[PDB]
Amino acid sequence: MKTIIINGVQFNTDEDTTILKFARDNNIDISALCFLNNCNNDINKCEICTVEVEGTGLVTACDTLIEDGMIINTNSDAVNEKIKSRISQLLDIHEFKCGPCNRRENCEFLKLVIKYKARASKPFLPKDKTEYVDERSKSLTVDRTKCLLCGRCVNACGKNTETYAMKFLNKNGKTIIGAEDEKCFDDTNCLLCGQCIIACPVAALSEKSHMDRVKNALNAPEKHVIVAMAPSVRASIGELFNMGFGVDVTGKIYTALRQLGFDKIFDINFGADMTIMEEATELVQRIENNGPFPMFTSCCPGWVRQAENYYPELLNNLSSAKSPQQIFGTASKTYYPSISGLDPKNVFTVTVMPCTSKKFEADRPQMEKDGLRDIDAVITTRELAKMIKDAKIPFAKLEDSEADPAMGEYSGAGAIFGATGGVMEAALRSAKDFAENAELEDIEYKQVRGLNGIKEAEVEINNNKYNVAVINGASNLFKFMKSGMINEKQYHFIEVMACHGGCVNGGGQPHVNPKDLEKVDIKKVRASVLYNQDEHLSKRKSHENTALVKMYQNYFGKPGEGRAHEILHFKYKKSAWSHPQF
Ligand code: SF4
Ligand code: SF4
Ligand code: SF4
Ligand code: SF4
Ligand code: FES
Ligand SMILES: [Cl-]
Ligand SMILES: [Cl-]
Ligand SMILES: [Mg+2]
Ligand SMILES: [Mg+2]
């Protein structure tokens, strides 16, 4: 047994762990910065986690194991001086102007500067930020005047995607982070998943803003602005309004969106039910046609980019159904005018997404018809929160309201899209009913749920056994393919999400402090809201959505045929690179 003494207090433990972990486990305060995802910045350690081990000297707590008889002071004058000195050095390369900053309310660096009363040896005040800023991407932005070179983004990219699209670069003899060859991220193997943003302690990495698109549309007299939120937003955005984790704020969002002046309140969960209508039908068609198997989901634009960039031979195997976002958008410019009298060109469709890659998806040149974009703007969960706060809307105090039903109703199947395994489960509910011409009672596919990276199941459909898999995170797609798992059996239907946990852990989601991530399983807690909705909804199958059924009966016809097939689908092709202008 190890006996260790920390700030005078004796501890008896068998644990083999770091000083930082043990201290955090035992409510002892130790600061940290570059340590995240069980890695610190091995080159250029930040040393913010410095503690004193009597007899040894100053050590970095985040990668120093506890040892029997250690006497540790986390708070000696020597320790605080070192840490304060490290923060001072960072201030020397940091434009410290928190007033207008988009991380002002939850910046890890600001909190450290305050805690240690750090001051720059010389304030960093660049007169021209243009050379520090990269806004070329459809999804990501970089502001290097904020960058601490902590490496958290580089490490998070590697672990979450294994693309290493985010790199340390030598630019004119000075270190920066950025994409390969300092290119626009979009032009590299990057998935635009934004996991790098989520890992950033400061405002250096952000989403490409669509807030001006939205505000200009809202203010244009002739525009009719639709807004529709993704499943995950209602399980997440309350975090930014002091409501804590795992709170369902669906009704509040609807009210807030009306107060922001949006002209129609719909819901992307309605779009998810549409995706299932088409994709479940397509699965049943492929069963009839002996393929092409496997069918892959196509609702995650991070995964679509991964396939385009690494596995172009799989593109024809993707489901042709548009994603919940784009399929909704398509309907919003066609069906919705048909039931409203609106001039289609005056409809402006806005989504709220937990995702940065959705911005790239919405701006794909061919995601339009007759000159009308499926989706005109995509704002992240974070962007919506800022919009609500700017408008002085008292979010946490709002009464609940309802969505406009025509493209706002949703089933429990659509509701769970935000969790890894969600589209798989939702699809199977409809596909098995369709194939067996039945209304089955047993609809919960718990085998495809949860945080395991690769999840498989055998599903009986119309008295044959089919093999399905759920790939949970872009790194696990690479594992699945590179390890040859893909060739161990015939797979028939495979879900792929780029973000581990699914969209509840997307790149547009609220940041979470590393200390809170230690206490809260954010992927599980956000997803729980969605599964809870599913359990409590009367309709738990996409094809039982009454507003959806009306829409097909009155406008689209039958899924996978006719008008539905013509405009609610999208196929990806391998082709020579071009600027999107072409
Ligand atoms: S990144 Fe943090 S410390 Fe820097 S200006 Fe923004 S809020 Fe202030
Ligand atoms: S968006 Fe995703 S793939 Fe691209 S650099 Fe960031 S973490 Fe890596
Ligand atoms: S962009 Fe953010 S996470 Fe990446 S090195 Fe800079 S401060 Fe760290
Ligand atoms: S898993 Fe969801 S949030 Fe992540 S890239 Fe895919 S669609 Fe976006
Ligand atoms: S947090 Fe330990 S070296 Fe950075
Ligand atoms: Cl309506
Ligand atoms: Cl979602
Ligand atoms: Mg290390
Ligand atoms: Mg208006």
Residue numbers in the entry: 1 to 582
What does the paper say about this structure?
[FeFe]-hydrogenases are nature's fastest catalysts for the evolution or oxidation of hydrogen. The complex Fe2[μ-(SCH2)2X](CN)2(CO)42– with X = NH was shown to integrate into the apo-form of [FeFe]-hydrogenases to yield a fully active enzyme. We herein report the structure of the [FeFe]-hydrogenase CpI from Clostridium pasteurianum in the unmaturated apo-form and the first high resolution structure of a fully active semisynthetic [FeFe]-hydrogenase along with the structures of three non-natural inactive derivatives of this [FeFe]-hydrogenase with changes in the inorganic active site. In contrast to already known structures of native CpI,3,30,39 the space group of the crystals was P21 for all five enzymes and the asymmetric units each contained two nearly identical molecules.
In this study we aim to expand the knowledge about maturation of [FeFe]-hydrogenases by reporting the crystal structure of the [FeFe]-hydrogenase from Clostridium pasteurianum (CpI) in its apo-form without the 2FeH-cluster (apoCpI). The crystal structure of apoCpI reported here is strikingly similar to structures of active CpI, both native and semisynthetic. The overall RMSD of the backbone atoms of apoCpI and native CpI30 is as low as 0.3 Å, while apoCpI and CpIADT display an RMSD of 0.4 Å over all backbone atoms. Significant differences in side-chain orientation are mainly limited to surface exposed residues with V423 being a notable exception. This residue in the central cavity is adapting a different rotamer, supposedly stabilized by one of the water molecules in the binding pocket for 2FeH. The structure of apoCpI presented here shows the three regions 405–423 (“plug”), 437–453 (“lid”) and 529–540 (“lock”) clearly in a “closed” conformation nearly identical to active CpI. Prominently, F417 in direct contact to the 2FeH-subcluster shows minimal deviation in apoCpI when compared to CpIADT, while it is moved by 15 Å in apoHydA1. Being devoid of the 2FeH-cluster, the active site binding pocket of apoCpI is occupied by seven water molecules and a chloride ion instead. Note that this leaves a water filled cavity of roughly 10 Å diameter in the center of the protein. Washed and subsequently dissolved crystals of apoCpI could be maturated with the synthetic ADT-bridged [2Fe] cluster to an activity of 1250 nmol H2/min/crystal, reassuring that the reported closed structure of apoCpI is not a dead-end conformation.
